[PDB]
Short mmCIF file of C-alpha atoms and ligand atoms in Angstrom, two decimals:
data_model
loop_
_atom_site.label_atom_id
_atom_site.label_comp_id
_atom_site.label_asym_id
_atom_site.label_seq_id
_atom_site.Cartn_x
_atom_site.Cartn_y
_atom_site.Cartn_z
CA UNK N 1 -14.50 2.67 -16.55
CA UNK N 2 -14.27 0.93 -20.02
CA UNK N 3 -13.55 -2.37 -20.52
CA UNK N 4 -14.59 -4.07 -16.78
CA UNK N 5 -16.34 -6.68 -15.65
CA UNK N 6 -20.21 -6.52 -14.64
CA UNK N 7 -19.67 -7.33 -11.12
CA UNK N 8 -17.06 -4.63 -11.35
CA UNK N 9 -18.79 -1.70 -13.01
CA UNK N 10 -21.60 -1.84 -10.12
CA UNK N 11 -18.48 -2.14 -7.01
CA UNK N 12 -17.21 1.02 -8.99
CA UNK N 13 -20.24 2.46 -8.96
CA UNK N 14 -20.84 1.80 -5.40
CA UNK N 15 -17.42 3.18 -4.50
CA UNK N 16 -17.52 6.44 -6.45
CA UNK N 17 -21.13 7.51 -4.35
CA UNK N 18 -19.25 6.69 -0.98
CA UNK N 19 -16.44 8.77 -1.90
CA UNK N 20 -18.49 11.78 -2.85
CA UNK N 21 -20.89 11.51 -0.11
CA UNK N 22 -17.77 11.28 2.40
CA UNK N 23 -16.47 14.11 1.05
CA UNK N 24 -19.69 15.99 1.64
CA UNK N 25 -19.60 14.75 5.05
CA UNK N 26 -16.22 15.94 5.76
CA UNK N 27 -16.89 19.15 4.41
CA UNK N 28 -20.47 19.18 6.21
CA UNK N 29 -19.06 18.21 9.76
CA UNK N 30 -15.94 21.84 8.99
CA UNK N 31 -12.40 19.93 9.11
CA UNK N 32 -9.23 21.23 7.83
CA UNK N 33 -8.02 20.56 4.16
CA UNK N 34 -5.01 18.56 5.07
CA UNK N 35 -7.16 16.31 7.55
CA UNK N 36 -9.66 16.24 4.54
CA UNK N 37 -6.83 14.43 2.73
CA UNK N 38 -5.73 12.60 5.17
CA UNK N 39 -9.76 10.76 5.53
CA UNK N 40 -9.97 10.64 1.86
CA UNK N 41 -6.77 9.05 1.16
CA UNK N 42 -7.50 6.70 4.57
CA UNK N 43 -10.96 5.78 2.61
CA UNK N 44 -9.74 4.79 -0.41
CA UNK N 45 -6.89 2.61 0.78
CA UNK N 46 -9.56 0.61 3.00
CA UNK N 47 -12.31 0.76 0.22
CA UNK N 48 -9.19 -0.75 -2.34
CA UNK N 49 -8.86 -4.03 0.04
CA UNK N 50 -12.76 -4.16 0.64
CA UNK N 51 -12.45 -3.83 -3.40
CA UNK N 52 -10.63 -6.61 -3.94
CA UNK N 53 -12.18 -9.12 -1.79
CA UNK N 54 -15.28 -8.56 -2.96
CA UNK N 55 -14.03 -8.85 -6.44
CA UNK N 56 -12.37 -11.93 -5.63
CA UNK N 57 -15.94 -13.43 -3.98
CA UNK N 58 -17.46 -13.11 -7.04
CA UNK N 59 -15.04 -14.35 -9.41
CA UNK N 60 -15.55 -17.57 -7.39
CA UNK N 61 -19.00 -17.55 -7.63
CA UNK N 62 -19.18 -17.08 -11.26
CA UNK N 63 -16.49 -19.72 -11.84
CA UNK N 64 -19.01 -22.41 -10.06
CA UNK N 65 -22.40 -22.72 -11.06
CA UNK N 66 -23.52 -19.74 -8.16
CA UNK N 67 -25.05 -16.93 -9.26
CA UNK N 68 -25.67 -15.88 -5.38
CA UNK N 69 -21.94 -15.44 -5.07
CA UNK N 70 -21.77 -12.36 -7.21
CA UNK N 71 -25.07 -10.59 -5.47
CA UNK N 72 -23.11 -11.48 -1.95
CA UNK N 73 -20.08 -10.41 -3.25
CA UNK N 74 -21.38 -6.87 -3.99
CA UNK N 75 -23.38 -6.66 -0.69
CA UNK N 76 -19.90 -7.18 1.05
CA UNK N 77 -18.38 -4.07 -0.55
CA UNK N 78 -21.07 -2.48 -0.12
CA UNK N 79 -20.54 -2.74 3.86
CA UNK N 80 -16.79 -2.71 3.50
CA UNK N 81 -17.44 0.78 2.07
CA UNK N 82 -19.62 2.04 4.56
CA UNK N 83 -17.11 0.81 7.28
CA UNK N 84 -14.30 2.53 5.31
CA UNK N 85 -16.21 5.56 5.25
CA UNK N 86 -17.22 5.72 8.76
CA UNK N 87 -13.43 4.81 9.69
CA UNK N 88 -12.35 7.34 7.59
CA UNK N 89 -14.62 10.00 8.85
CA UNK N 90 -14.55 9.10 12.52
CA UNK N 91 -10.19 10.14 12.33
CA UNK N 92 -8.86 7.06 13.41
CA UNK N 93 -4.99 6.13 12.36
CA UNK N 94 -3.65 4.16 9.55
CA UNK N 95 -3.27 0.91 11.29
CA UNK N 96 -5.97 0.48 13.75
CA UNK N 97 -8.27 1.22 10.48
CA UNK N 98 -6.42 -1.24 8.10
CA UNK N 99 -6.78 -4.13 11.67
CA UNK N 100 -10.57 -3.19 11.69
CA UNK N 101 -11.03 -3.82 8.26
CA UNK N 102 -9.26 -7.31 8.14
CA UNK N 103 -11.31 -8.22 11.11
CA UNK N 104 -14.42 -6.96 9.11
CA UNK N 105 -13.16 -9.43 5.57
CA UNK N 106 -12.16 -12.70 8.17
CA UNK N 107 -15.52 -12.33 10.38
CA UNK N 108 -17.36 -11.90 6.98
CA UNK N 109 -15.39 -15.05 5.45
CA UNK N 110 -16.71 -16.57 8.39
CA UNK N 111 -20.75 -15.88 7.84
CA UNK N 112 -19.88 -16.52 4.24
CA UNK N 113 -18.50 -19.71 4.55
CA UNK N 114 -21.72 -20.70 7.44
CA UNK N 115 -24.13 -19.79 4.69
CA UNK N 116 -22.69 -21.16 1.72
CA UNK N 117 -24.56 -24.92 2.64
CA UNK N 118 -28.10 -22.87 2.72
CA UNK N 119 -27.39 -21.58 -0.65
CA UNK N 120 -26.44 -24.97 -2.18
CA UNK N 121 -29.91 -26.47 -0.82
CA UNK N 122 -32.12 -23.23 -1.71
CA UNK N 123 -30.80 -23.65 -5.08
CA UNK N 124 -30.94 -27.45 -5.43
CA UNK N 125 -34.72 -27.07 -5.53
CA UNK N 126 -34.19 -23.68 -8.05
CA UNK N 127 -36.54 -21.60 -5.52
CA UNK N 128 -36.12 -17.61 -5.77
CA UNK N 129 -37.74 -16.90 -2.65
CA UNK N 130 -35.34 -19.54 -0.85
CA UNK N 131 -32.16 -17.09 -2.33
CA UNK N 132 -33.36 -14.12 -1.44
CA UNK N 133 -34.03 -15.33 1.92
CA UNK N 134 -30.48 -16.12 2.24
CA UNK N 135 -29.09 -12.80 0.27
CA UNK N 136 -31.36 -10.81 3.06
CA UNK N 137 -29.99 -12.96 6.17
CA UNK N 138 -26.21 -11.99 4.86
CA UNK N 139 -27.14 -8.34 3.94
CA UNK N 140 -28.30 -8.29 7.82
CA UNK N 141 -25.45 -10.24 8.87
CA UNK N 142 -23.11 -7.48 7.46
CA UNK N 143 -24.78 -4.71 8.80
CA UNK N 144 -24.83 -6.38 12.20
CA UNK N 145 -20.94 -7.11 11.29
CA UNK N 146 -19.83 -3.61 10.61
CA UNK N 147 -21.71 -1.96 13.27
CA UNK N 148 -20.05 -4.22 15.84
CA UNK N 149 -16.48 -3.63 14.13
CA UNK N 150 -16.98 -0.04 14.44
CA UNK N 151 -18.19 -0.32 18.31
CA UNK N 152 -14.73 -1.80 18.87
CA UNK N 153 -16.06 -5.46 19.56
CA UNK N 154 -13.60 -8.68 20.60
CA UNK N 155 -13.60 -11.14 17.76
CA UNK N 156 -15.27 -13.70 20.35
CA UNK N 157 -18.13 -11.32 20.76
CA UNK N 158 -18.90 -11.00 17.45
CA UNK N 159 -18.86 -14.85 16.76
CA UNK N 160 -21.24 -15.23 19.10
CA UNK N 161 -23.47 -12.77 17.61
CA UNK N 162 -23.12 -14.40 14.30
CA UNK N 163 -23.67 -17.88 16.04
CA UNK N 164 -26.73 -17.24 18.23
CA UNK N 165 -27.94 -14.66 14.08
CA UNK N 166 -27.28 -18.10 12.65
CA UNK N 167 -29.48 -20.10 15.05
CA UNK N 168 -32.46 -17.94 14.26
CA UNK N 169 -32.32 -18.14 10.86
CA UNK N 170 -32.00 -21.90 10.49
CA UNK N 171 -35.43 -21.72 11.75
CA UNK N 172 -36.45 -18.94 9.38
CA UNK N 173 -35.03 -20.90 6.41
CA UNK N 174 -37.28 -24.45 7.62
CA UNK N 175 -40.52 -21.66 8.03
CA UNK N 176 -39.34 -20.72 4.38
CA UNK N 177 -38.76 -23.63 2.66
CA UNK N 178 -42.14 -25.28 4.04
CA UNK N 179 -44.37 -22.89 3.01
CA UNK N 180 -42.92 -22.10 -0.45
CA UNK N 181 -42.61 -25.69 -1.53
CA UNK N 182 -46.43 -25.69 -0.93
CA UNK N 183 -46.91 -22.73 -2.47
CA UNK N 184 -45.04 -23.81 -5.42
CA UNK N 185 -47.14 -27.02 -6.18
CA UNK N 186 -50.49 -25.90 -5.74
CA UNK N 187 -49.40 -22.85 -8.34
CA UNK N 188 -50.84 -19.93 -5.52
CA UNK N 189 -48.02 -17.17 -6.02
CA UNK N 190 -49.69 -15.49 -2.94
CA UNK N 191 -48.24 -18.03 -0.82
CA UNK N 192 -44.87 -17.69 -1.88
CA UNK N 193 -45.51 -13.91 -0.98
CA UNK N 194 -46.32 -14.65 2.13
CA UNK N 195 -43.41 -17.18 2.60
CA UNK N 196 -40.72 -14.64 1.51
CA UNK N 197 -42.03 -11.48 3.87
CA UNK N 198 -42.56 -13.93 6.72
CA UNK N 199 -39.46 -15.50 6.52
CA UNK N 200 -37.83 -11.86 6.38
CA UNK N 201 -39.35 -10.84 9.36
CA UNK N 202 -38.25 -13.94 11.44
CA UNK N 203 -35.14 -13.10 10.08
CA UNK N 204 -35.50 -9.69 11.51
CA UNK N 205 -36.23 -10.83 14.59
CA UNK N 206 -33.56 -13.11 14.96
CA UNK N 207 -30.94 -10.53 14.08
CA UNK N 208 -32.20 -8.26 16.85
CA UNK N 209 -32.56 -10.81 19.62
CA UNK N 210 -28.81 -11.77 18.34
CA UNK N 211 -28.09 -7.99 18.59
CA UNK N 212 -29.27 -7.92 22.01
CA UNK N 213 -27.02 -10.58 23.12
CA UNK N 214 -29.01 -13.59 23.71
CA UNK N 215 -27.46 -17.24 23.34
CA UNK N 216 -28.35 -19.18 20.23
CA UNK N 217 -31.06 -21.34 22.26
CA UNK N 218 -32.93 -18.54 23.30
CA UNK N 219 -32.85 -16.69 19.92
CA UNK N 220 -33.91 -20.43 18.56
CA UNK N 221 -37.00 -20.75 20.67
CA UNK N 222 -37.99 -17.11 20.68
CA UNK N 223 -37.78 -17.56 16.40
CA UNK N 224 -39.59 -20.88 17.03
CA UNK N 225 -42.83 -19.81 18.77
CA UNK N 226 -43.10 -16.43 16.04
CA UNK N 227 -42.48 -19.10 13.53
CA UNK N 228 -45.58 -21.26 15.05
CA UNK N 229 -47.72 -17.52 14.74
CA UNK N 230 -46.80 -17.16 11.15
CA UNK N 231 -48.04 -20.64 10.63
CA UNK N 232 -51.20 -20.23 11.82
CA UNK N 233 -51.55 -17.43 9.51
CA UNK N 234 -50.33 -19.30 6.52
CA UNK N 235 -52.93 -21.44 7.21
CA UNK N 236 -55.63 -18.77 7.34
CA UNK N 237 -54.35 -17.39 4.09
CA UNK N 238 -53.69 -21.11 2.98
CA UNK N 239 -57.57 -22.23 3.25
CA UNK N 240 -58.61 -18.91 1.84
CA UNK N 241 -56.71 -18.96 -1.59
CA UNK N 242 -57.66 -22.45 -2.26
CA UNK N 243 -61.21 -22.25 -1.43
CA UNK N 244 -60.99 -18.82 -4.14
CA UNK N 245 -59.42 -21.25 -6.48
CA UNK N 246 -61.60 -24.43 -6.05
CA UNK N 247 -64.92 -22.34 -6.43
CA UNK N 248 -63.40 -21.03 -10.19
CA UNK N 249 -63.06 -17.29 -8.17
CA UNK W 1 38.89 24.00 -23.65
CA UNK W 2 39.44 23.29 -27.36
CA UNK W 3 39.70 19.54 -28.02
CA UNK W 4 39.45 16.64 -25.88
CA UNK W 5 37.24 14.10 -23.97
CA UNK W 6 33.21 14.64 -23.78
CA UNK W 7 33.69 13.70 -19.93
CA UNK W 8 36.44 16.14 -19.68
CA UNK W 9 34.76 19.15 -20.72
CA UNK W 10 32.42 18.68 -18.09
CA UNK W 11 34.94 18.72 -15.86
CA UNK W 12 36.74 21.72 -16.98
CA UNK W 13 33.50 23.92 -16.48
CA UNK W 14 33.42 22.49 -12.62
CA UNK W 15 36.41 23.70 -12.28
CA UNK W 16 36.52 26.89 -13.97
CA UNK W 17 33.14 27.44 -11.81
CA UNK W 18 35.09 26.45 -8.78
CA UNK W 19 38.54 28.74 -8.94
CA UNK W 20 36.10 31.46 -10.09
CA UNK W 21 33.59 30.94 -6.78
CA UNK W 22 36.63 30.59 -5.06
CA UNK W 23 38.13 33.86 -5.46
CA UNK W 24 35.00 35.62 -5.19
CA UNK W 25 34.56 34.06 -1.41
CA UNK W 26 38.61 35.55 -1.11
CA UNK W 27 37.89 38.72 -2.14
CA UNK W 28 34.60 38.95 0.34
CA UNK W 29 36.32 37.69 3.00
CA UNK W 30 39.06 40.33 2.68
CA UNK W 31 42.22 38.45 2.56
CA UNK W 32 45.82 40.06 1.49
CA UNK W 33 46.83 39.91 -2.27
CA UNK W 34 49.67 37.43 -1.05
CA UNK W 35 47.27 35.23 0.65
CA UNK W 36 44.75 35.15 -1.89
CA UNK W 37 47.62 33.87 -4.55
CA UNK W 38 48.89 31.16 -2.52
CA UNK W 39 45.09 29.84 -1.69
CA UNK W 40 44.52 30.20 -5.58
CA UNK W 41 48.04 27.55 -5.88
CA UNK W 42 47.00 25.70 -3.36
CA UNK W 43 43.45 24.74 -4.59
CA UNK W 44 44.88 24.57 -8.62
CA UNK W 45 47.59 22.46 -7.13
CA UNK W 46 44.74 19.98 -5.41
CA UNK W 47 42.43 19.98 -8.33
CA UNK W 48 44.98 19.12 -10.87
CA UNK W 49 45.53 15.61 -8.60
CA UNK W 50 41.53 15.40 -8.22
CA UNK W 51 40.92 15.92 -11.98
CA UNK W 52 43.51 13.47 -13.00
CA UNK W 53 42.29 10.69 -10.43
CA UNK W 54 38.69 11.62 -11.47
CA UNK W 55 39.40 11.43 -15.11
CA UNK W 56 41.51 8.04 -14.66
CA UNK W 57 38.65 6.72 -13.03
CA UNK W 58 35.98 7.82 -16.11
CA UNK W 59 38.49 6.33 -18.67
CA UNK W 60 38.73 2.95 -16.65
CA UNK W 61 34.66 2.88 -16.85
CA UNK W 62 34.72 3.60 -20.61
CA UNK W 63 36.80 0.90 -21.66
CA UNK W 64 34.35 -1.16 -20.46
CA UNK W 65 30.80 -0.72 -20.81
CA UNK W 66 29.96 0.84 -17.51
CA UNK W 67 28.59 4.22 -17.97
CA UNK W 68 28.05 4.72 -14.90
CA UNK W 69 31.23 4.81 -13.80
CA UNK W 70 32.01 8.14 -15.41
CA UNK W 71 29.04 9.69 -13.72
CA UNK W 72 30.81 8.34 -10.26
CA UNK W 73 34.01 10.13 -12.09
CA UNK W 74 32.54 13.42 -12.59
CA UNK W 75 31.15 13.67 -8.84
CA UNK W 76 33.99 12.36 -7.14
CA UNK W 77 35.70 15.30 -8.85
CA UNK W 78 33.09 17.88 -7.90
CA UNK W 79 33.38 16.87 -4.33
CA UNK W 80 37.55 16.59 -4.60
CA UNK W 81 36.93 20.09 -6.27
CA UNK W 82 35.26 21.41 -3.18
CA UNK W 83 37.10 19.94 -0.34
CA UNK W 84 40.22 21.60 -2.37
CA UNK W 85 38.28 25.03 -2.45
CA UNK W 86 37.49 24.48 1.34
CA UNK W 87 41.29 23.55 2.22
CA UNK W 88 42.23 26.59 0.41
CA UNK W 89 40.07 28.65 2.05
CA UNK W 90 41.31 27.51 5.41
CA UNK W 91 44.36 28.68 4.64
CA UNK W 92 46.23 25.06 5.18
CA UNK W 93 49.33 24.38 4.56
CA UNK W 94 50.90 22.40 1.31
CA UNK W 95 51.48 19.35 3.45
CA UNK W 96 48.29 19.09 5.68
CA UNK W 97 46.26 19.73 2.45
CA UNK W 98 47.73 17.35 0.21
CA UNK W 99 47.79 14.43 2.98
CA UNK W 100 43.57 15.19 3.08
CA UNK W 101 43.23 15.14 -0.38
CA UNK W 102 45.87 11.52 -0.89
CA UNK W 103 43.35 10.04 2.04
CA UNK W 104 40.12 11.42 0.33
CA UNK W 105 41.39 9.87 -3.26
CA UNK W 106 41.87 6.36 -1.00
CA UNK W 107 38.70 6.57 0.86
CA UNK W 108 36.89 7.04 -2.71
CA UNK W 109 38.61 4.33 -3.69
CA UNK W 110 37.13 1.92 -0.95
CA UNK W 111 33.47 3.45 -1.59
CA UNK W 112 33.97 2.89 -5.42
CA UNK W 113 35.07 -0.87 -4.94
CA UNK W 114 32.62 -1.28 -2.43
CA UNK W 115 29.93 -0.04 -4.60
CA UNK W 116 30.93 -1.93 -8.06
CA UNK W 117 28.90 -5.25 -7.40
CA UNK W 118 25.85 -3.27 -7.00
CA UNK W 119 26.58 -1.67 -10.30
CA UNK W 120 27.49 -4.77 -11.94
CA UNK W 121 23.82 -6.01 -10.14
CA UNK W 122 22.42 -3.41 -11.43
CA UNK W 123 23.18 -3.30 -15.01
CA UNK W 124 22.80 -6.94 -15.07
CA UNK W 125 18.80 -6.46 -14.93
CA UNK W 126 19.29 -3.45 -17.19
CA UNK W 127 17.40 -1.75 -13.89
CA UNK W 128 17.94 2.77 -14.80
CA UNK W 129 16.31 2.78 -11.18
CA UNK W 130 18.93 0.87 -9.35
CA UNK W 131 21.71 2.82 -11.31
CA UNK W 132 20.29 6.17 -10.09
CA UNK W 133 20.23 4.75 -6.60
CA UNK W 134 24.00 3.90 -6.80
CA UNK W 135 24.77 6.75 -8.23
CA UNK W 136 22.61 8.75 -5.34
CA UNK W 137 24.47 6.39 -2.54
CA UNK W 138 27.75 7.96 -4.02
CA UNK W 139 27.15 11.17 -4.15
CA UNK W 140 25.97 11.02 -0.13
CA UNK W 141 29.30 8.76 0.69
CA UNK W 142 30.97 11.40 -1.30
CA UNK W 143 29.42 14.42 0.80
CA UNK W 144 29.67 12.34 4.41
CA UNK W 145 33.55 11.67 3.50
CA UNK W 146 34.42 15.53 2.01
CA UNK W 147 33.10 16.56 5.38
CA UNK W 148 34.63 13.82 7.21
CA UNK W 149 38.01 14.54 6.04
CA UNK W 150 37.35 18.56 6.37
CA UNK W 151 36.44 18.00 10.47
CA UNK W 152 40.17 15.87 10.32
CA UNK W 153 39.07 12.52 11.63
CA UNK W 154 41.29 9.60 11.09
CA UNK W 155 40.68 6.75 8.68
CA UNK W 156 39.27 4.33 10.93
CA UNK W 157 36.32 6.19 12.31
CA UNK W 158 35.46 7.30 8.01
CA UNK W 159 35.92 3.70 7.60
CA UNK W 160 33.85 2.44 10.22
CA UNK W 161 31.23 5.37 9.38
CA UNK W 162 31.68 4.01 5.71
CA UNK W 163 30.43 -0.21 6.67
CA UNK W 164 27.59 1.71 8.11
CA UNK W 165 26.33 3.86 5.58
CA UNK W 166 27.15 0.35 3.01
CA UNK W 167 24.99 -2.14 5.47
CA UNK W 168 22.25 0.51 5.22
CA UNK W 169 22.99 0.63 1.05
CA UNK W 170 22.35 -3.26 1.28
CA UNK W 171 18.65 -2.73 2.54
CA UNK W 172 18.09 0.14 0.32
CA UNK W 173 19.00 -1.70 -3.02
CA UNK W 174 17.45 -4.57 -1.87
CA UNK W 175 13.98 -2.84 -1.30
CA UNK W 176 14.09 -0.75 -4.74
CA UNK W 177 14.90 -3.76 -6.66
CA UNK W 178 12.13 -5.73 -4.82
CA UNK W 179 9.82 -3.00 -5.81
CA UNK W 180 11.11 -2.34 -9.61
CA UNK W 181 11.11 -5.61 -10.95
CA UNK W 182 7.41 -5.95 -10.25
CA UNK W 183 6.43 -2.40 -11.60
CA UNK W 184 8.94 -3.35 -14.09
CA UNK W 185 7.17 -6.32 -15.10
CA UNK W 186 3.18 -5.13 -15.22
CA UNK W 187 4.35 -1.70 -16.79
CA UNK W 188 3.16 0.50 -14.24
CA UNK W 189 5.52 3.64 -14.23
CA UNK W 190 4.32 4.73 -10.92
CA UNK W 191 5.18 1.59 -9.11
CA UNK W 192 9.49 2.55 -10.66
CA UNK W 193 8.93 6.07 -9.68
CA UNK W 194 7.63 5.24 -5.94
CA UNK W 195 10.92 2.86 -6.09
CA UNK W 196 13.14 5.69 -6.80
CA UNK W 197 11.81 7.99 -4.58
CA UNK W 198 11.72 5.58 -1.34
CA UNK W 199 15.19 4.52 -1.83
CA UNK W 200 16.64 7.38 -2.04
CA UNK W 201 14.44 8.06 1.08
CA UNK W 202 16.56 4.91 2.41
CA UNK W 203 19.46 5.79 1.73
CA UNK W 204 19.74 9.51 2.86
CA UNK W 205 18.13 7.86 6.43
CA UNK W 206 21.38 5.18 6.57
CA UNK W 207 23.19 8.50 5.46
CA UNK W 208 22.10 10.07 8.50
CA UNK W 209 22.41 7.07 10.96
CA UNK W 210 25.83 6.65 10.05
CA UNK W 211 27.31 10.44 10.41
CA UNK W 212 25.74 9.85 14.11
CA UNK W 213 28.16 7.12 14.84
CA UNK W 214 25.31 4.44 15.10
CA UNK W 215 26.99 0.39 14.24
CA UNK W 216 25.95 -0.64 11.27
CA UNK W 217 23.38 -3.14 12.62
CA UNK W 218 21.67 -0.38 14.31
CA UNK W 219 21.35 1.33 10.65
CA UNK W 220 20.39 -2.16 9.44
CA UNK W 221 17.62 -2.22 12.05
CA UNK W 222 16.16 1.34 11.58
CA UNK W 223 16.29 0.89 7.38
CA UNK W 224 14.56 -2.36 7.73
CA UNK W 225 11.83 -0.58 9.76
CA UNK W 226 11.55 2.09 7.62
CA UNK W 227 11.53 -0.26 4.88
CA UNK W 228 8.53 -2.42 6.00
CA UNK W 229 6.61 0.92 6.41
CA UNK W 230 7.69 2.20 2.83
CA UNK W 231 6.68 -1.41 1.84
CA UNK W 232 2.93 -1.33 3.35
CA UNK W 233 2.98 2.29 1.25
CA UNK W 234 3.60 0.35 -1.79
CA UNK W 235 0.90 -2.41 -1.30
CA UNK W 236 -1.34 0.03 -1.12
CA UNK W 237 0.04 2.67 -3.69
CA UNK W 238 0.39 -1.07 -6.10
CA UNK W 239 -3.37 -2.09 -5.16
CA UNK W 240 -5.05 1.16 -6.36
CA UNK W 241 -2.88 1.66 -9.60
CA UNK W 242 -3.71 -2.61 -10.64
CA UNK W 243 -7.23 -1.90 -10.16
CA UNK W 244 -7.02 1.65 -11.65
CA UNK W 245 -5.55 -0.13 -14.88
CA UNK W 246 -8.04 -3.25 -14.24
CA UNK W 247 -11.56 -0.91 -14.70
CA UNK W 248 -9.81 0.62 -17.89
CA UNK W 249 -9.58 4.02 -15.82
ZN1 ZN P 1 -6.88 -9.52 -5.50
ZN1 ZN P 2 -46.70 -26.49 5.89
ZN1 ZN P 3 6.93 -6.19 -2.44
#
């Protein structure tokens, strides 16, 4: 509506397109109108609290000097939403849905407040590729989060999901941050190309060995000898672009 | 009636509408023309001593500056107005009928005093939510104790049913002033209304647990309960009408 805040306009947005496509749902899947009600009224309490703490994210970021905050804030409720939604649709009561989705906001808190450091150092040395690195690891991080929630997982579980998810991608980040410091001084935009997709794909991986249930060393290693792959590669590509730039090509 | 009081008037049409209902239930029933006199003396006889209390009682309130306590005037005489009609239509005597009507006009008196701090409480933070629910309380004591007194029960078991329906008064007030103040305070109409409506909800449930018999701490109990889940209602009825007003919608 008028008179909001940027952040706010996009989270409205966001919630108005999960409410009608819900609704289509409902009506796709042949339920009654009062149980209609019922999920729609179920949704938008759920998607009000998922609202607000996303809201309240990125007021903090924008208050500090962290203009990741607001683009983590709005991934956040995006994935509250979805989780409303699929609470909503799936018929479950008022209070297991309202426990599921303060489990979703702590456990997220949680990744949140583990990836906060990697956002202070990727933007300590003002590299884009380093951000969206870490906006991509918490996007998968919340789908991996809301798909357990929904499955009906222990909050120990899911810790150690995020744990062993946060193992691989400290190795991810390092793969990162190496290549795209070179790539960065030697002025060869191809290699912070390839230091972006590369890192999201290790990042990838990570979050499906973490998916699969693996401990954090295993995840680590696995990530480690892809990592060593990748490298090779970056040199390849490495050798080639600076060989096209030394010969004036 | 040509002249006289504005609360009086009032009055006058109840009973007018009264005598008049009265006779019509005398004449279906398919009395004698002796026995419909006498229960036409009997009830004028009763509602002369209920309109005179009642009307003592409004001109006690209007000296000071309570209006309220002329609306608790008027319906304690519409409910002294129809136990009257009912004792006439019993066909009780002019001793059993007037003893029930001296022990109603006493038993009003202990609900009125019992109820005049809230009042006091309630015009004190100029609350027109909190005098609606005192006024709503009475006119339910005033029902359970009409009955009461029709089903001849003594005046401990009233009394006792009277503490009851009062301790589960306490936790109504309580939780409609809780919620009033703050809708009060951000102007949100909806937040007063919701207020209104749930403790009236309150009150007709420690209505009910007291004509059962129940102590009062068991009516305590079940209106706190009822409470919390009227108060979860309210977080989430507050949440979406804050942010509704927040987005300029
Ligand atoms: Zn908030
Ligand atoms: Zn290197
Ligand atoms: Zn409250």
């Amino acid at each position: 509506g008028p008179g909001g805040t940027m952040a706010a306009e996009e989270m409205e947005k966001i919630f108005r397109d999960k409410l009608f496509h819900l609704h289509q749902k409902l009506d796709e899947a042949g339920k009654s109108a009062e149980e209609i009600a019922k999920a729609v009224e179920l949704f938008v309490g759920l998607a009000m609290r998922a609202f607000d703490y996303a809201l309240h994210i990125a007021e903090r970021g924008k208050e500090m000097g962290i203009p990741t905050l607001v683009e983590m804030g709005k991934i956040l409720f995006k994935y509250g939403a979805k989780l409303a939604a699929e609470l909503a649709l799936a018929g479950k009561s008022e209070e297991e849905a309202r426990a599921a989705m303060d489990r979703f906001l702590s456990l997220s808190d949680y990744l949140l407040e583990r990836l906060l450091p990697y956002i202070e150092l990727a933007e300590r040395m003002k590299s884009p590729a380093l951000q969206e690195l870490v906006l991509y690891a918490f996007k998968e991080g919340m789908k991996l989060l809301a798909e357990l929630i929904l499955a009906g997982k222990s909050d120990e579980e899911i810790q150690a999901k995020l744990d062993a998810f946060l193992a691989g991608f400290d190795v991810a980040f390092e793969f990162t941050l190496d290549i795209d410091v070179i790539g960065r001084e030697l002025d060869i935009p191809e290699l912070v190309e390839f230091a972006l997709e590369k890192g999201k794909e290790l990042v990838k991986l990570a979050l499906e060995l973490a998916r699969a249930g693996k401990s954090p060393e295993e995840v680590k290693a696995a990530v480690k000898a892809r990592g060593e792959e990748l490298h090779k590669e970056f040199e390849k590509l490495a050798l080639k672009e600076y060989f096209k730039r030394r010969l004036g090509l």
